[PDB]
């Protein structure tokens with residue numbers, strides 16, 4: 072990787088999220104989104120390291136602080152859509168063509184820390200919040216499918232979640248140090264997803280009833296000893312990080328225990344490896360994997376970019392010294408984008 076370009080956003084506020092759109096064709100434009108302050112900005116990656124600003128969405132609320140964004144497509148037309156949320160706990164669905172807000176979802180009793188679209192069903196949006204719960208939305212019928220939390224749910228703010236390869240289960244983590252598994256391929260959850268597609272507030276006067284999932288399918292507080300701010304699946308394995316300067320690769324149960332044969336009572340975990348690094352002991356630092364899950368990338372609090380081949384390397388520039396909050400690889404992994412606390416964007420090409 073070589074640094075081929077760099078730019079700073081005029082608002083000067085930290086950039087907390089960055090996502091390439093992976094739903095674009097080959098030979099179609101390479102687009103990425105950035106979130107920070109009350110803004111969502113679109114960019115196009117061109118030949119010889121050029122970054123072209125497409126458009127920005129500025130939210131009406133000046134005190135809204137976007138923390139996350141995620142890309143989806145309209146199943147019927149294949150046109151891209153972008154979901155954004157943050158400190159207001161409002162989900163906004165933006166039309167990237169016109170950078171206009173199509174619709175919004177209110178529900179969470181505090182800020183939204185991460186947004187994730189279901190890997191198979193583009194209408195299924197997962198939100199994680201400071202209110203201790205996860206929420207699964209059907210953005211086609213504008214319904215709240217399920218609320219994950221309560222009694223045996225997270226006991227503090229949820230910082231991250233990720234679906235497995237096929238979107239049969241979610242793993243979430245937060246300030247309570249725990250990592251919780253929630254199966255969505257249960258009869259109850261599949262009937263709720265099916266039911267949510269048949270709902271229309273125009274054909275009934277009764278509300279749609281959300282599944283209230285009070286108990287996870289697995290839980291552990293044995294991986295990390297501090298806030299768990301990032302979680303991602305690597306097949307049936309889990310990669311998670313705290314602020315203890317390591318990304319831990321682990322799994323529920325014992326060495327030969329199948330994740331789908333694990334009972335909720337399961338008290339064992341198996342650590343399969345660690346990715347050690349330095350100066351990334353501040354809360355809110357995300358790691359990211361490329362489309363193929365062939366590469367791992369994590370930025371540190373002083374502008375260093377760690378990149379590991381999953382089949383280490385440090386990417387530095389003297390002008391890059393602020394905390395790198397999030398990174399994103401293009402679908403083909405040829406480009407890696409890093410976003411910083413000083414509103415700066417850094418482009419690294421293979």
Ligand SMILES: CS(=O)(=O)c1ccc(-c2cnc(NCc3cccc4c3CCO4)n3cnnc23)cc1
Pocket residue numbers: 085087088138139182183184185230231300301354355356357396397412
């Ligand atoms: C410059 S400062 O004033 O010290 C500061 C620093 C961090 C935050 C902040 C960032 N991010 C989120 N949530 C999203 C999130 C969650 C997990 C990992 C992760 C992210 C974004 C990057 O890595 N926050 C929720 N509440 N505060 C925050 C706000 C102010």
Ligand SMILES: [Ca+2]
Pocket residue numbers: 331
């Ligand atoms: Ca399985």
